Amino acid sequence: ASSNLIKQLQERGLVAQVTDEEALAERLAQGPIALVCGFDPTADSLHLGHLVPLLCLKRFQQAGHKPVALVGGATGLIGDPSFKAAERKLNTEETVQEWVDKIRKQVAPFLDFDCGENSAIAANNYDWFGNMNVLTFLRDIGKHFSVNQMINKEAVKQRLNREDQGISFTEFSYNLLQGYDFACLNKQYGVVLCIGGSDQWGNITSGIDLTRRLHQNQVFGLTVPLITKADGTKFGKTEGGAVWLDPKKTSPYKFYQFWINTADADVYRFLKFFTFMSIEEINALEEEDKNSGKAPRAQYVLAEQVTRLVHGEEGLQAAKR
Amino acid sequence: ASSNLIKQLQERGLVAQVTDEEALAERLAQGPIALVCGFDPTADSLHLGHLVPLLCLKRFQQAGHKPVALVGGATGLIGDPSFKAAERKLNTEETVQEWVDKIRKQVAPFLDFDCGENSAIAANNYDWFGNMNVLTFLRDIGKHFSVNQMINKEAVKQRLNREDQGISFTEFSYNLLQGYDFACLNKQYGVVLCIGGSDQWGNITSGIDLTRRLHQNQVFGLTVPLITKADGTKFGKTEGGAVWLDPKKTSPYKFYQFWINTADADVYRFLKFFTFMSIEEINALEEEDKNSGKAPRAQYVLAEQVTRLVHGEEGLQAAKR
Ligand SMILES: N[C@@H](Cc1ccc(O)cc1)C(=O)O
Ligand SMILES: N[C@@H](Cc1ccc(O)cc1)C(=O)O
């Protein structure tokens, strides 16, 4: 009884929030849809913080849907303030342009760009913002945004009720750029769903509302949960900084080691978030570790699964030498 | 004892607010400065609501300063929300472009464009916003604006504490456009003072702050009072709408009639706001009307003075036929 995709992702604990779940589930049953997940070039590589949303894009593709991997060539020149305590550093056009190509190439191996009509599409919002006049933006896009609504958006609320956290007009405008990305992708590729990290709810719903206002099309949003560790410490954060997906920044060996170090309380949940093993197999593995008087083998399984996903068979082998 | 320009305008009741009056008065004594007053093309003509600021630009020129008359080819495509209850209507590029030339030509006769180094300059902010990329605006200008500060700006405060008054991102951004106009004019023409209507304080101070942030130059602002009538009704507002400065919209005859109709309680104050008669002469005229047992002749004087200023000798003559 293949209940449905949203339900199956829910079992994995991968659905934080979703707009009109009933309507989305029916839409998904109608046929393959185009969906999008965006990634901003805040560095020359993505890191573990972007992995769950990325693999989730792959889960949709495996269910027959078409993933659009958007790299923020323009949004990365603005900076997303969503649930951020401080103003992000402004990078130069030259540097972000370079980071954009690096990230695009890093994302490609994760998706299938050669499987028929549901083949993946790489997008860059610099295509439409890169040369958009400011008056056009303020009028054609800005007229549809209520500042009253924008200021009580949870993602930036804390930055407004400050005494230690302010927000520039630059980052405050980010919500309109991402909102228009949704409308623009709906118009050109028929994208009707946008998924993203948990801090992306307000940016996504702005896109839903603007697509309705501009094109009169109903689209949807779904956010994945922010990954947490039972010990309350920050996931993907180590003494040496982030765990990068780039083998030249974080070696496959070090990556494999990061996963081996997973706590017992997190490992089964992590198997669900980061791998494609069935729920049935993960539960059986949990039971197996419970009844064996052996070291749990879940950490080894997780490390093996994610390392291969991220660095392929070659990376997995480099992890043992 | 030519005390000083700010003082003399104060005697006329023409100074609503001024930034660092002491510092401005000393700067004015140093020599002729370039100053600016802007006008947005919200119609194909200016009206009585723009007259006081316009003549004030002329008062500065007569004191030896250089007036820059800025017409908002770009700002008129956005709309100033300052102390406005509702969102302004968005006009098309074609229409505003046309209104811009009409207004520029209407303003010219009021200023001297042929008197040496203090000759007037006509400016249009469409020159710098017309083709400015949105990313450039948001980054190079937007980074210097605190949204926390923008939202408690008096000019838009009421639009935020609503239940009957909201504000679009479009009009909320207007403050940055006008603020940059000041910085841009300071950089190219050395403009160090901006004057404007009373509702312009926050737009002007944003320009002062941004000029400091961008060019590290100290500039000043001065607003003229919003004209009021003793009977509490709206000045420049009639049954037929606005009193236009365009003779084809409001005939010189009708214009002269508007002034003749001035109430006794307003006429002496209006002589100060709208004419170049000395304060001494206006006071003597008030005394004369007080002691004559004749109809006051102040209304006739006012009508004659302003009609000539706005429509010249030809207009004045057309007012008697
Ligand atoms: N704002 C998203 C990335 C993103 C960028 C542009 C988009 O259109 C969508 C998503 C993030 O910070 O993860
Ligand atoms: N905002 C002013 C007009 C103006 C426009 C642009 C400026 O740079 C300055 C002033 C008004 O509404 O009267």
From Swiss-Prot, chains A, B:
Subcellular location: Cytoplasm
Binding-site residues for L-tyrosine, renumbered to this chain: V36, Y174, Q178
A single BP term in Gene Ontology: tyrosyl-tRNA aminoacylation
Source organism superkingdom: Bacteria
Modification sites for N6-acetyllysine: K143
Span of the annotated motif 'KMSKS' region: 234-238
GO MF, any single term: tyrosine-tRNA ligase activity
Post-translational modification: Acetylated at Lys-143. Acetylation at Lys-143 leads to slightly decreased activity. Acetylation at Lys-84, Lys-234 or Lys-237 causes dramatic decrease in activity.
Motif annotated as 'HIGH' region, chain positions: 41-50
EC number(s) per entry: 6.1.1.1
Regulation of its activity: Magnesium is essential for activity. Inhibited by chloride and sulfate in the presence of 1 mM free Mg(2+). When the Mg(2+) concentration increases to 10 mM there is almost no chloride inhibition any more. Inhibited by diphosphate and AMP. Chloride strengthens the diphosphate inhibition and weakens the AMP inhibition. Chloride weakens the binding of Mg(2+) to the RNA and thereby the interaction between the enzyme and the RNA. Acetylation at certain lysine residues could significantly impair activity. D-tyrosine is a competitive inhibitor of L-tyrosine for the formation of tyrosyl-tRNA(Tyr).
Keyword Transcription regulation among UniProt keywords: no
Catalysed reaction equations from the record: tRNA(Tyr) + L-tyrosine + ATP = L-tyrosyl-tRNA(Tyr) + AMP + diphosphate + H(+); D-tyrosine + tRNA(Tyr) + ATP = D-tyrosyl-tRNA(Tyr) + AMP + diphosphate + H(+)
Keyword Plastid: no
Signal peptide: none
Site positions per UniProt: Cross-linked with tRNA by periodate oxidation: A230, K234, K237
Entry GO terms, CC: cytosol; membrane
Applied use: Utilization for in vivo protein biosynthesis of mutants that charge azatyrosine efficiently to tRNA may lead to efficient production of azatyrosine-containing alloproteins, which have immense potential in biotechnology and medicine.
This protein's UniProt keywords: Acetylation, Aminoacyl-tRNA synthetase, ATP-binding, Cytoplasm, Ligase, Nucleotide-binding, Protein biosynthesis, RNA-binding
Binding site for ATP: K237
Subunit structure and binding partners: Homodimer. Binds one molecule of tRNA(Tyr) per homodimer.
Protein family according to the UniProt entry: Belongs to the class-I aminoacyl-tRNA synthetase family. TyrS type 1 subfamily.
Functional note: Catalyzes the attachment of L-tyrosine to tRNA(Tyr) in a two-step reaction: tyrosine is first activated by ATP to form Tyr-AMP and then transferred to the acceptor end of tRNA(Tyr). Can also mischarge tRNA(Tyr) with D-tyrosine, leading to the formation of D-tyrosyl-tRNA(Tyr), which can be hydrolyzed by the D-aminoacyl-tRNA deacylase. In vitro, can also use the non-natural amino acid azatyrosine.
UniProt name for this protein: Tyrosine--tRNA ligase
Organism from which the protein derives: Escherichia coli (strain K12)
Portion of the full sequence shown: 2 to 322 of 424
